[PDB]
Amino acid sequence: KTPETVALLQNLKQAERKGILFGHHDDTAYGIGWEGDKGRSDVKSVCGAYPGVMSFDLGEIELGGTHNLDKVSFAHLREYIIEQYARGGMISLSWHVRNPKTGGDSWDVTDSTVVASVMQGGENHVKMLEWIDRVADFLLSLKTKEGVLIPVVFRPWHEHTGSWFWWGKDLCSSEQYKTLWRMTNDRLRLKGVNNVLLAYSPGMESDTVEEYLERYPGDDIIDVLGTDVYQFERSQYIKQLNKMLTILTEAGKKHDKPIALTETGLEGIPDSLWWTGTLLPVIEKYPLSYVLVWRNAREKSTHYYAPYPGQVSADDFVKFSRSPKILFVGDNFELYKLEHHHHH
Ligand SMILES: [K+]
């Protein structure tokens, strides 16, 4: 891993001391009522600072086209990534990859033999490695104008304990799933992709650490232990989020990995006090390195997870943002600076 990448990991590992970076998907790409405006951010428009983490998706890079599945160009993603690094924030990338057997999208679960087909000897193995190489080439293009590779937390194969993606629980064995991870790591390493940290991120199906780790590909592959948990009903969310963050904290101590709430949110945040009244009291109890809420879909204006100006939860988001526990660009962290000393 590059020096800046090791520094990022070491700074994620001191979350207990520094606080929780706040994140938003596609934050500088678009939001409610806009797309592509230079420097614009629904998060910054509400609270005045950029989120400490921004994530974007590489889905459809494997098809060799110019835009991802959410119609954002890869050349724009690279710009947004360079700009987030320049201001000192973190970047994460997910990968809603197409179905290599059916030609469908990530959510095509018609065929439960897709992962088998990309194993060694399978009809789609070479193509799967070509697809991963296309991700590798994009990652290698994430450079500062001075030529420094930009560290990224790459989070492929997510939500694998559910069965809504073609790599999900009912669609492959535990060993097949771990092999996806090994193929991914192998190709990234061969390509010299030394600017990636890998994050593991199943949802809330697991009730225990044993279950959470059943499909874990190993400490030598994974750098960040995450989970994706959304609010559908408040009491259940509080129970299930506490349950998963307890699992993450226990597992992260057992395996010496930082932890993160890699996706969460309340769609349309109709609860005007969601941020301080529901989310913060849960997450502040756990040593999270970051918490990321999902995109503000310009193309479906009910589908948003961060506020925007005038949105009913916006004032409360401002109050949340002022918590010393929650970190935005401008706050007291330096992700890419090594402080050169062991933990004790
Ligand atoms: K803050």
Residue numbers in the entry: 30 to 373
Give passages from the manuscript.
A putative β-mannan PUL was previously identified in B. ovatus ATCC 8483 (bacova_02087–02097) and shown to be transcriptionally up-regulated when galactomannan or glucomannan was included in the culture medium. This PUL contains the genes bacova_02092 and bacova_02093, which encode the putative GH26 β-mannanases BoMan26A and BoMan26B, respectively. Clan GH-A enzymes share a (β/α)8-barrel fold, a conserved retaining catalytic mechanism, and essential catalytic residues (nucleophile and acid/base). β-Mannanases generally have an active site cleft with a varied number of sugar-binding subsites (−2, −1, +1, +2, etc.), with the reducing sugar being located in the + subsites and the target mannosidic bond connecting the sugars in subsites −1 and +1. Galactomanno-oligosaccharides are further processed in the periplasm, degalactosylated by BoGal36A and subsequently hydrolyzed into mannobiose units by the β-mannanase BoMan26A.
A 3D structure of BoMan26A was obtained using molecular replacement with the structure of GH26 mannanase C from Cellvibrio japonicus (CjMan26C), the closest homologue with a solved structure. The protein displays the expected β8α8-barrel structure, which is conserved in all GH26 enzymes, with the active site located in a cleft. The catalytic residues Glu-188 (acid/base) and Glu-292 (nucleophile) are located at the ends of β-strands 4 and 7, respectively, and are conserved within GH26 (40) and other clan GH-A families. Comparing the structure of BoMan26A with that of CjMan26C with G1M4 shows that the −2 to +1 subsites are largely conserved, with residues His-125, His-187, Trp-193, Tyr-259, and Trp-323 being conserved throughout GH26 (28). Beyond subsite +2, the active site cleft becomes more open in BoMan26A, lacking several residues equivalent to those in CjMan26C. Because of crystal packing, the fused His tag of one monomer is situated in the active site cleft of the adjacent monomer, potentially aiding the formation of the crystals. Based on substrate binding in CjMan26C, loop 2 appears to close off the area beyond the −2 subsite in BoMan26A, despite 18O labeling showing that BoMan26A is capable of accommodating a mannosyl in the −3 subsite. The low B-factor of loop 2 indicates low flexibility in the crystal structure; however, a stabilizing factor may be that Asp-99 in loop 2 hydrogen bonds to His-373, the last residue in the His tag of the neighboring molecule in the crystal. Thus, loop displacement to generate a −3 subsite cannot be ruled out in solution, especially because the equivalent loop is shorter in other endo-acting β-mannanases, giving a more open active site cleft.
